[PDB]
Amino acid sequence: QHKSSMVYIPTTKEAKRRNGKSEGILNTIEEVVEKLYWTYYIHLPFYLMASFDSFFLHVFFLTIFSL
């Protein structure tokens, strides 16, 4: 092969497995929380909105749940 001027960005799994960050006792809860947050946030419009309206909609959903 021949070298080039490209800087390769490592993938998340490789970085995590070479960082020793993975810990069975105290990472499953973090992964579950991450999944719950991302699934809730992606499939519903918060990401093209404004801060005031996004906060208002968050409060609306929170009140709907609390009731």
Binding site: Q1, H2, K3, S4, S5, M6, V7, Y8, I9, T11, T12, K13, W38, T39, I42, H43, L44, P45, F46, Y47, L48, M49, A50, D53
Partner: protein, 554 residues
Amino acid sequence: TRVPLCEPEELPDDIQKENEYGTLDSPGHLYQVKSRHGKPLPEPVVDTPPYYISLLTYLNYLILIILGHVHDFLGMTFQKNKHLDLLEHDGLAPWFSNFESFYVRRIKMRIDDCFSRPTTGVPGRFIRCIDRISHNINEYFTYSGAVYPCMNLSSYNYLGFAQSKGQCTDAALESVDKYSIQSGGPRAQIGTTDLHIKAEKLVARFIGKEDALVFSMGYGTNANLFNAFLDKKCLVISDELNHTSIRTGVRLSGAAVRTFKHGDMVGLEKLIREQIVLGQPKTNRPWKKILICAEGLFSMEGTLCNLPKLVELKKKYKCYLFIDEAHSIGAMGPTGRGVCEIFGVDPKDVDILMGTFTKSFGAAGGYIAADQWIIDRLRLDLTTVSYSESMPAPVLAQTISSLQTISGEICPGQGTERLQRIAFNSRYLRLALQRLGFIVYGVADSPVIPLLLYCPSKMPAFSRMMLQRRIAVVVVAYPATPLIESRVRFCMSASLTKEDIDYLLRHVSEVGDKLNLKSNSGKSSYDGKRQRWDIEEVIRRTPEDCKDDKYFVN
């Protein structure tokens, strides 16, 4: 506050050559396509996602539309001083009213950072992008003068002729030395040189027609071609997914327009029969002529047109045929002749053939090919020839060099390797993506691989996350597309290699797992079973099996 001018980088020859064009790894990574011999083209099949995705999409768009009008009404009513652009100052109307610019301001504005990105240098397999920072909400940007390379899957260079060191560049420099950069004027009083006639004859021989014409711009070619021979008493039958240039040309011509659904031939035949019977409106006199306009390959869908059926219909009903092929003149076919080569159709059946050099040959311009007794009339009846500027010399030299390279004259075995490389890359990427579990469109050979993203808020996340991985992609959405279906369009090139595709596959697999973008059914695999393969198995087994023409549904 201003785009900085970037100083060129000084590197040895080998590094820059590798940056522009990548060397082959193994000779087993090539694929030679085979002719169809005229066997029928089956009807395409499309996969669908579950219901809840569509329901969520509908709710998202409804909420966005309501909130946009709420903000517009409140802001226009109360805070007048802030919005002075949309109000009349002194007896003068504004440049535009609020209503027609609703979609641009209300939903598109929040996504303006994923659309226009300045770059520098030659676009090869690695593209250099300028770094910028967003202020307010995509209102203006601040630039720190820093550059960084990215992999490009968004540029129109199918055969990889965009280079800074090669025979074409040498020819362009020699032409600049010999002929100056300036032209004389319209190609009827001064501005025609022997290079123009040489390019004319070379293109005419390469396509297979008898005579041709060369223009400096493609959009102008289409916008000015139609009014020369069409009139108010004629009829034009065209598809519903044609390019904008054809629509503008037909509007300027003034003829009547009827449209038929995409991919339906029974409807086309019924429409032709009815239009022949009825005649002109309000007088019911017969039409003077009927013309059929179509496209060789559609970029938004990556599907082919059924040429033999069109030829049969035009022979039976005595109609004329016009074919637009700019994405398929150099990248498709056993030898790269076009759509007329894969189907085995004789070139003399079609009346007018058009194409552009921008996509595959690395130079700007367009052409038109037809019979001698038609070109002789058109050279007089055209308005581009006698009123507009002429094509420059370096562009002609580049086009001639590219055509002689593809034809196999100047270099023995360079074009065939490019054709085989692009075919293999397209097949491998499409098969790997389908085996992962995504949804793609195509005909197993088109260089366009559209991957579908359905939720409105997933396209910016995908774009930003791919940018963080140093990959450049282009995403399109409403109204350019149907409301429900948004997509990301991949443009595969011959310059990329297999290891780049493996890197891309790993990163896209991780991002899709994170964003929940892979939802496949049994209608996409040949065995009828939904497939979710692990990544390393895909990498191990796909490149060998991608050669057999049985694993692809369409």
